[PDB]
Design a protein around this ligand. Structure first.
Ligand SMILES: CC(C)/N=C\[C@@H](O)COc1cccc2ccccc12
Ligand SMILES: *[C@@H]1O[C@H](CO)[C@@H](O)[C@H](O)[C@H]1NC(C)=O
Length: 431
């Protein structure tokens, strides 16, 4: 895609902190950028749309390469069009804004590069307020193995880059992304909703879901893929799980893992109020060159340090962190194939963390599965009493996009106090 000039692109500021054991925490003047799929796409020479509603203009876009040459991504009115605001340290993502639904933004080091986070033997911490983020919605904060320049160096057809939020990939190998590898994804374009569609290509990479949650349920989940870095896929390679990527991931959802009273409204982690989420990425030898061996989670709320809940499932050791053994046990216990291990498990996840990943923040609803995999019974055809089927208490009828978009359009999530750095350094304790 080309870089449009009709609307200035001004990235909201969202400061973060980098932390070391000896030096403490220091601010970084980071910013956020709207993902390219949400932007206006129009002829490079004027104002005519290349994409309107859920279809491309086949005059401007008869093929992927021609489209990318003819068409430009443009600047965004963050608040007015997309419901995205920042105080400078706290990011608010509103659910519906006019006909716009959801958003995803990435953390930038500066105006043309994503912040590249290298979290092996490090920790990531943030605060979240989900008080207004109900059943069926997901406020997600996650890492993807995107390129810092959004693909510009690799793909001559992409002249827009990180400044316009290009180069997305994730473990689901999504085919709804409009620009991949510097080409419009117009092949066999298929409408999937009023403003969305899919093309013949998907875009795949390893993904670490630090936080997928609403006020009913939360999960953290590594998803390794066999490839390294953002990869365009077609055919069977795009297929979730059996293709390049572990689409299911090895998830830790406290409720799915058998503690139904740990996290939710008025629970131990009280989702009716803001709280802090710490995630630590430990290696076997406590070095940044070691193999990722454990992902730990600590919460802080009202100054109380809250350890993660323990798993309580027959055949699963009662642990409270993600390890390769936990993954094998829960997969067997839940009847799920260990695609996670098939793609190389935590070691493979760690190599992606080691090479650096980009931080995404998003609010969304789910047209495929109504978010039931997060907060209800999934699959919808299994007995909810079987180990693993039940992930939350939301009704099995909840989360249909047409419903939540009309019923709770002013839902929002607030992500703040973003910090990363040495293990144990982004937060402190005292007696
Ligand atoms: C934040 C996103 C990109 N991370 C991963 C999510 O897409 C996981 O989604 C999912 C995970 C597992 C099963 C599913 C079934 C239907 C729809 C989505 C599913
Ligand atoms: C790594 O650190 C952990 C604490 O999380 C500690 O228990 C362990 O002894 C350390 N291992 C080595 C090799 O120093």
């Amino acid at each position: 895609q080309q870089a449009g000039t009709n609307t200035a692109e001004n990235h909201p500021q969202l400061q973060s902190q980098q932390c070391t054991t000896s030096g403490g925490c220091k601010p970084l003047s980071t910013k956020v950028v709207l993902d390219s799929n949400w932007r206006w796409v129009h002829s490079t020479s004027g104002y005519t749309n290349c994409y309107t509603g859920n279809e491309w203009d086949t005059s401007l876009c008869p093929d992927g390469k021609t489209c990318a040459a003819n068409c430009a991504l443009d600047g965004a009115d963050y608040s007015g069009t997309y419901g995205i605001t920042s105080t400078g340290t706290a990011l608010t993502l509103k659910f519906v804004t006019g006909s716009n639904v959801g958003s995803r933004v990435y953390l930038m080091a500066d105006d043309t590069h994503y912040q590249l986070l290298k979290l092996l033997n490090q920790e990531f911490t943030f605060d979240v307020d989900m008080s207004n983020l109900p059943c069926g919605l997901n406020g997600a904060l996650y890492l993807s193995a995107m390129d810092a320049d959004g693909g510009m160096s690799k793909y001559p057809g992409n002249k827009a880059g990180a400044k316009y939020g290009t180069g997305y990939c994730d473990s689901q190998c999504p085919k709804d992304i409009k620009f991949i590898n510097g080409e419009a994804n117009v092949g066999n374009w298929t409408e999937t909703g009023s403003n969305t569609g899919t093309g013949s290509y998907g875009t795949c990479c390893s993904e670490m879901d630090i936080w997928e949650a609403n006020n009913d349920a939360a999960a953290f989940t590594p998803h390794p893929c066999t490839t390294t870095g953002q990869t365009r896929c077609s055919g069977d390679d795009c297929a979730r799980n059996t293709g390049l990527c572990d689409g299911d991931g090895c998830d830790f959802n406290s409720f799915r893992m058998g503690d139904k009273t740990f996290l939710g409204k008025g629970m131990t982690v009280d989702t009716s109020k803001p709280f802090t989420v710490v995630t630590q990425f430990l290696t076997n030898d406590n070095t940044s060159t070691g193999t990722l061996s454990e992902i730990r989670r600590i919460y802080i709320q009202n100054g109380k340090v809250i350890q993660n809940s323990v798993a309580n499932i027959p055949g699963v050791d009662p642990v409270n962190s993600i390890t390769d053994n936990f993954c094998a046990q829960q997969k067997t216990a839940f009847g799920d194939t260990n695609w996670f291990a098939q793609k190389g498990g935590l070691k493979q996840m760690g190599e992606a963390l080691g090479n650096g990943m980009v931080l995404a923040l998003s609010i969304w609803d789910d047209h495929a599965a109504n978010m039931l995999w997060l907060d209800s019974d999934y699959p919808t055809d299994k007995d909810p009493s079987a180990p693993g089927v039940a992930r939350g208490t939301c009704a099995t009828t909840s989360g249909v996009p047409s419903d939540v978009e009309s019923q709770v359009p002013n839902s929002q999530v607030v992500f703040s106090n973003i910090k990363f750095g040495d293990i144990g350094s982004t937060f402190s304790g005292t007696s």
